């Protein structure tokens, strides 16, 4: 949890999520556009379901120091991103780190710092019932 590199290594990587609704493709959270208005097409959306999740494959194991989430901003539904974990997984898809968050507290973004963790996947997992996961962008930075 000290300095991080400036390059967003999640941009343009393979992304996936638990389901897709309202056209909100998982790749919208790694398209290099943090615009949080759903109508501008750069925010993801899963079904309303239990324990929705979204993941990016960094494509190799990297030493991750920071993951920045940008929430949806339009429609007074920003609170759907609450009671969730940010998880780092190794190449074998085992958990190597996990942090839980109750809220973003109305902030547009959350910066999550990891202590130099070697991981290939970054996952956001909701812990709530019957709630869709929408992210405008997830950016990931290596430890410096
Ligand atoms: C009609 C269509 O093509 N899609 C609508 C959704 O409307 C589109 O996307 C919205 C976010 C706006 O950009 C809207 O102008 C656009 O037509 C529609 O979403 C609701 O749309 C109303 C306006 O009609 C409000 O914007 C509302 O906040 C939207 O609902 C929210 O966003 C959705 C994507 C879901 O997450 C809802 O649960 C939210 O409450 C959806 C609305 O059900 O229906 C499509 O037909
Ligand atoms: Ca985006
Ligand atoms: Mg507009
Ligand atoms: Mg893959």
What would you note in describing this structure?
The protein has 144 residues and is mainly β. It has one domain (1-144): Galactose-binding domain-like (Jelly Rolls, Sandwich). Helix content is 0%, strand content 43%. Strands 1, 2, 3, 4, 5 and 6 form a six-stranded antiparallel sheet that branches. The termini are close together. A molecule of 4 linked components (NAG-GAL-FUC-FUC) binds next to loops.
Structural topology:
Blueprint lengths: L13 E4 L35 E19 L12 E6 L5 E7 L7 E18 L8 E8 L2
Antiparallel strand pairs: 1-2, 2-5, 2-6, 3-4, 3-5
The site of calcium ion has 7 residues, from strand 6.
Please outline what is shown here.
Mg(2+) 3 binds at residue 57. With 144 residues, the protein is an all-beta fold.
Beta strand %:
35-45%
Supply the helix-strand structural class. mainly beta
Question: What is the CATH architecture term?
Answer: Sandwich
Count the strands?
Answer: 6
Main beta sheet strand tally, sense and closure: 6 strands, antiparallel
Q: What is the CATH level 1 assignment?
A: Mainly Beta
The count of helical stretches stands at 0
The name CATH uses for the topology is Jelly Rolls
Small molecules bound in the structure, each named once: a molecule of 4 linked components (NAG-GAL-FUC-FUC), calcium ion, magnesium ion
Q: Name the overall outline.
A: globular
In total, the number of domains comes to 1
- Helicity, as a percent range: under 10%
- Radius of gyration equals 14 Å
- Ends distance: 10 Å
Topology as a string of helices (H) and strands (E): EEEEEE
What is the name of the CATH superfamily?
Galactose-binding domain-like
What multimeric state do the chains show?
monomer
